[model samples]
Target: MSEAVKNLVNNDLADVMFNRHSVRQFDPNVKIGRDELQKMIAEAATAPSACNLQSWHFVVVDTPEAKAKFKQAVMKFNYPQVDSASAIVFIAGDTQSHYVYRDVWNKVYEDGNITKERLDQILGTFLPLYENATPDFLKFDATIDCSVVGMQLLLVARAHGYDANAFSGIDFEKMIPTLGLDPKRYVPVMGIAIGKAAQEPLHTTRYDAKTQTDFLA
Candidate 1:
C-alpha cells in the first residue's frame, strides 16, 4: 500500500480530518517514493474544476539540484521547509485551461456520459465564455481552482502520515524561468511542502460551523 493509503487503513476520515494541520518542521531522514508521491498527486487531481477543464499543474521538486533552485527562487523564510521536506509541490494554474475542451468533453461523450450535440453545445458556450475573458478573470479562476486541489493534496498527505504546509512567500515570476515553465501559459498558485513532521504542532483555533455559516431562511 502507498504510505498515505496505509494511513487511511488505520485511521478513518474523521481521524485524518481532525489531525490535519500545517506542520513546518520535518524529519529530514524520511522520504517518500516517486510512485507513491505521484499517486497522491493523482488523487489530488480528482478535485472538481469550474469548467471541468482540470487546469492544475504540479511541479514536484524533491531532488538536491531542484531543492537548491527552489531555495534560491523562494523567500528566505521558506528555506527551512524546502530543505527539510520530502518534496515541494509547486501548484500552478493553466491560463489555457479551456483549450482542453475537445479532449475532456469528447472523452465523456465516448464514455456514453454525454452526446456529441451536447458536447458541441458545451464547447460553443465555453469557448466564447473564456476566449474574450479579461486577464483578471482568468487569473482569478485559475488561482482559486488550483487552491482547491492544493487543499485536497495537503489533506491527502496528512492521511498518508505526512505533514504539509504552504506559503505565498514566493517570487513566482522568477520561479517560472527557474523551473523552465512558460509564463504565458501558466501562473504559479501556491507551494506545498510535504514530509514527515519532526515537531508536534499545537492545535490552532477554528470557528464553529454556526459562527461561520449563515442560513438563507
Candidate 2:
C-alpha cells in the first residue's frame, strides 16, 4: 500500500483509462456492424476460464424485436437512455462443457496422461457422491466463468471506442422462457449493452489504495 503498482505501464492505456466512463446514455442512431461485433467478442473470448473449460456462448441481440424482448425480460434496466444500443450481448456459460474439457484433456494427455484421469475422476466420481446433486453444480461453475468473460467483453467494448454497461438485478427466471436455453446446459450470467457514448458520465470513484490494499510480508 505504500506505492502504487501499474499493470498497463503505458501512456495509451493511461489515456484510455482516463477517458473510460460508464455511459448510461447511448446514441440509438449508431448500430454496431456485424464485422465489428464479431471482432469484439473474438477478443473477449481470450479471457481465461475454469479448467480451460472455455464453457461460454454469447448472443448479440441487435435486431429490433430481439432487443425489445430482452429489455422487457430485464426489469429496472435503463431503457429510456439506451433502449436498443448497438447490441445487447447475452452471455451464458455452458456448464456441460466439463465433458468437452475432459475430452480435450484426454486427447492432450493421450496415452494414460494424468490430466484426463484427474478431471475424469472428479467429474465422474465426485459428481455421483451426492445422489441429489443433479447438474446444478456445473451451472454454478458456469456462472462464475461466464462472468469473467463478460468482464473481458466490457473491456473490449471500451477498447473498441464504445460504452458498455453490465446489469443483472432483473428477472432471470422470466428470461429463460424467451432465451430458450436448457436448464442442464447453458445459463445466463450477465448482459452487456454496448454503443456509442451519448453523454459524458461521472465514473464511480474507487477507494484509495491504502483503504483497499495492504502488505502481508
Candidate 3:
C-alpha cells in the first residue's frame, strides 16, 4: 500500500481515539482561543465535498448565556457536555449552493473558454442534473462533509490537549432556532463541546479491520 493510503486507513486509531465518557464533567476554565478554532475549522474545510459545494457552516457557542441555552435545549439527550465545556459548536449544511458552481462554470464557458458545442453539452446535461439532484443525495453530501469537519475539530481539540464529544440526539429543528438558522435552507448536522478533560475515561472497543473492511479486489 502507498504510504498515503496507509497513513489514512491503516494508521493506529485505537491507541489514539478519544475516550468519551458521560461523566457530565469538564474543566470550564480552559478556554479555546479563537485563532485555534479558526485553524481547526480550516483544516476540516480541506475535506473533499461532492462537486465542491462545501455546504457546511459552523456556529460556535462560547458565551455563558448561549451555552446555558444549549444545555436547556438538549433534553432530547442529557448533553451534559453543553454546559461544562468551554466551547459548543453546531454545524449546519446548506441545501442550496449548486447554483454558485453553475454561475462560475457558466461564466467560464461564456468567456470564449469553450466551444459552443461544449457549453451546450455542459449545461444541457451535467449542470441541470447536478442542480436537480435528489434530496437524499444533497443530504448525504452535506452531512458527510460536515462529519469530516467535526472529526477535524475533535482532533485539533485533542492535539491542543482538550476533550470533546458531539451530540447527535438533539432535535435538529429546535437546534436551528437556537442557532438562528434558516429553516428553509440550512439544517443542523451535529453539535460538539470542547474543553480540558476532567478525566481520561475508558473508551469502548470496536470491531477489528476484518470486520470493518475487506479487499474486494
Candidate 4:
C-alpha cells in the first residue's frame, strides 16, 4: 500500500474520534497558519452533501480586524473564543446551490469524469427542482448541508491536533454583512473557534448505541 493509504488504515482515528470534545478555552499565543487551516477545511469538505451540491461556504476570521468584527456578532459568553482562538470560522450555506451544481458538473464533464449525457440528465433533473424551490425549502436544505460540513470540520480540527468549539448563538444578520458575504445568497449556519486548548476539555458521557438503536430486521 502507498504510505498515505497505510497511514489511513493504521492511524488512531478511533482515538481522535472518541477523545474529541468541545474546547472553550484556547491558548492565545498558539497560531494556525492559513495553509494548514485550509488543509483542514479541505478534509472537512469530503463530507457528503445533498445531490453532491456541497453548498457550504466558510469565512475564516483570523485577522485582528476581522475577529473584532466577529466578536460583536456573537454572544458575550463566546467572546473569549473570539479573542483567543487562532481563528473563528463562520459556516454558511449557499441558497443557490443549483448554480454550484451546474458549475461543478460542467467541470466534471470537461474533465471526462462523466459523460455529457449524464451531466445533462443530472442538471435537467435537479436544476429546475432547485430553481423553483420555495424559500423555506431552500433554507432547510441548505441548513442541513452546511451543518454536515460544520460537524466534519470539528472532527478535522481534532485530527490535526487542534481543539474546537461550535457556537450558534450568533447574530446572523450582522455576521453575514460583517464578514462581507451577501445575506441574500448565504445563510449562516454556525461558528467554530479552533486552536490549541488552554486547558483540557471536560469529558462527558453519552447514551449507548444499544439504547438508541432500533434495528428493524
- On TM-score, the candidate that comes out on top is 1
Q: Model 2: per-residue lDDT, tens digit, 124-208? A: 7644433344567777777877888888777778766687888775577766556777755677777788988885556898878
User: Candidate 1 — worst ten consecutive residues by lDDT sum?
Assistant: 2-11
Evaluated at residue 112, the lDDT of candidate 1 is: 94
lDDT, candidate 2, at 144: 78
* Residues 36-69, model 4: lDDT tens digits: 8898888889999888888899999998998887
Which structure is stronger by TM-score: 1 or 2? Answer: 1
Model 4, residue 28: C-alpha shift (Å):
1.0
Candidate 3, 65-170: lDDT as tens digits: 8877766557635556777777877888777756687666677677988777876776676667657789777777778878877877666556455667877777
- Which parts of model 1 have CA positions greater than 4 angstroms off? 1-7, 199-217
What residue runs in model 3 are displaced by over 4 Å at the alpha carbon? 1-24, 104-126, 199-217
**Candidate 1: RMSD over Cα atoms?**
14.7
TM-score of 1: 0.83
Go through the candidates in order and give each one's C-alpha lDDT: 0.84, 0.71, 0.70, 0.85
Ranking by lDDT, best first?
4, 1, 2, 3
Q: Of the candidates numbered 1 and 2, which has the greater lDDT value? A: 1
Model 4 C-alpha lDDT versus the unseen true structure: 0.85
Candidate 3 or 4, higher TM-score? 4
